[PDB]
From a paper:
Cytochromes c′ occur in methanotrophic, denitrifying and photosynthetic bacteria and have proposed roles in protection against nitrosative stress, NO trafficking during denitrification or pathogen defence. All cytochromes c′ have a 4 α-helix bundle structure containing a heme centre with a solvent exposed proximal His ligand and a buried hydrophobic distal pocket with a non-coordinated residue (Leu or Phe, rarely Met or Tyr) in a position to exert steric influence on the binding of diatomic gases. Unusually, cytochromes c′ are able to utilize both heme faces (distal and proximal) as a means of discriminating NO from other diatomic gases. In order to understand the factors controlling distal versus proximal NO coordination, we have examined NO binding to AXCP variants in which the occluding distal residue Leu16 is replaced with residues that are smaller (Ala, Val), of comparable size (Ile) or larger (Phe).
All of the tertiary structures are similar to wt AXCP and only salient points concerning the heme region are discussed here. Ferrous structures show the different residues at position 16 to lie over the heme in a similar manner to that of Leu16 in wt AXCP with the exception of L16A where the side chain is essentially truncated.
Author numbering:
A (entry chain A), B (entry chain A): 1 to 125
Amino acid sequence: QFAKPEDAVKYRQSAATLMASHFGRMTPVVKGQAPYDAAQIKANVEVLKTLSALPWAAFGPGTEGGDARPEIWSDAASFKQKQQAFQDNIVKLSAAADAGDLDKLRAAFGDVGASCKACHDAYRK
Amino acid sequence: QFAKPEDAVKYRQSAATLMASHFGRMTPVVKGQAPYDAAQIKANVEVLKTLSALPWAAFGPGTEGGDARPEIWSDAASFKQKQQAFQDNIVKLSAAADAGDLDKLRAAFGDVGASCKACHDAYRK
Ligand code: HEC
Ligand code: HEC
Ligand SMILES: O=C1O[C@H]([C@@H](O)CO)C(O)=C1O
Ligand SMILES: O=C1O[C@H]([C@@H](O)CO)C(O)=C1O
C-alpha cells in the first residue's frame, strides 16, 4: 500500500508511536500508581492488540530505511520469530486484561515489554 | 496519557498517518483498478474502524500545537460534531464492507472522504 519505501517507513514509525502510547500508558496502572479499572484496561489492550499487528507488513521487500536494520531482511526468519513471539505475548496480555486480574496483567505487561526490547536490541539501529 | 502537549500532537499525527494509509489504500479498489476481495476489505475497514476512534482523545485541553487550529478548542461542540459525523460515516463504511457490496463500498468511501476533508477545511491549519 506504499508508493515509495519512505511511505512504508513513515507507516511503521507511526504504528510504533501508537503502540508505545497504548503500552506505556499502562505503566502507572501496573505499578499501582494509578487505579486499576479492569474495563478500561480491557478496552485499551484491545486497541493495542490491533496496533500490534500493523508494523510488520510495512517491512516488505525494498522498504529498507528509517531505523530498521538491514538484518530484518537478510534474516527474515529470525525477525519473523521476534514478531510472532511479541504477538504471542500480546495474546497473553489480552487474556490477562480480559480476565480482570492485575497480578496477571503486571506479569504479562512485563513479558510484552521484554519482547519489544529484544526486537529493538537486535533489529533497530 | 501524554506527558507534554507535544506528545499529544505526535500521537494524533501518527493516528492520522495510519488512517490515511488504511483509507487511501482502498482507492484503487473503489475505482476498480485493483480487484475487490470482500474479505480483504472487510478486514481493512475493521482496522480503519479502530484507528478512526483514536485521534480525538489526543486533542484534550492544553494540547494546542501541530497543525490543529485553535478553533478546535474554542468551538468544541462544532468540532465534536465533525468528529462524530465522521465516525458515523465510518460505521456506514463498515456496514458496506461487512455486506460485501462494491457499489455500497464506493458510495460509503466517498462519504468518509468528504468527512475527512470537511474537518480539515475547518480545523487543520
Ligand atoms: C520487531 C519484531 C519489533 C517489535 C516486537 C517491536 N518493535 Fe518497535 N521498532 C522496530 C523497528 C525495526 C523499528 C524501527 C522502524 C523504522 O523503520 O525506523 C521500531 C521502532 C519503534 C519506535 C520508534 C518509532 C519512531 O517514531 O520512529 C517505537 C516508539 C517503538 N518501536 C515501540 C515499540 C513498542 C512499544 C513495542 C512493543 C509493545 C515494540 N516497539 C515492538 C521493531 C520492533
Ligand atoms: C476532525 C473531526 C478530523 C477528521 C474527521 C479527520 N481529521 Fe485528519 N486531521 C485533523 C486535524 C485537526 C489534524 C492536525 C493534527 C495536528 O495536530 O497536526 C489532522 C491531520 C491529518 C493528517 C496529517 C498528519 C500528520 O502526519 O501530521 C492526515 C494525513 C490526516 N489528518 C488524514 C485524515 C484522514 C485520512 C481522515 C478521514 C479518514 C481524517 N484525517 C479525518 C482533523 C480531522
Ligand atoms: O513503552 C515502550 O516499551 C518498550 C520498551 O521500552 C520496553 O522495555 C518501548 O520500546 C517503548 O516505547
Ligand atoms: O486519504 C486521505 O483522504 C483524505 C482526503 O484527501 C479525502 O478528500 C485525507 O485527508 C487523506 O489523507
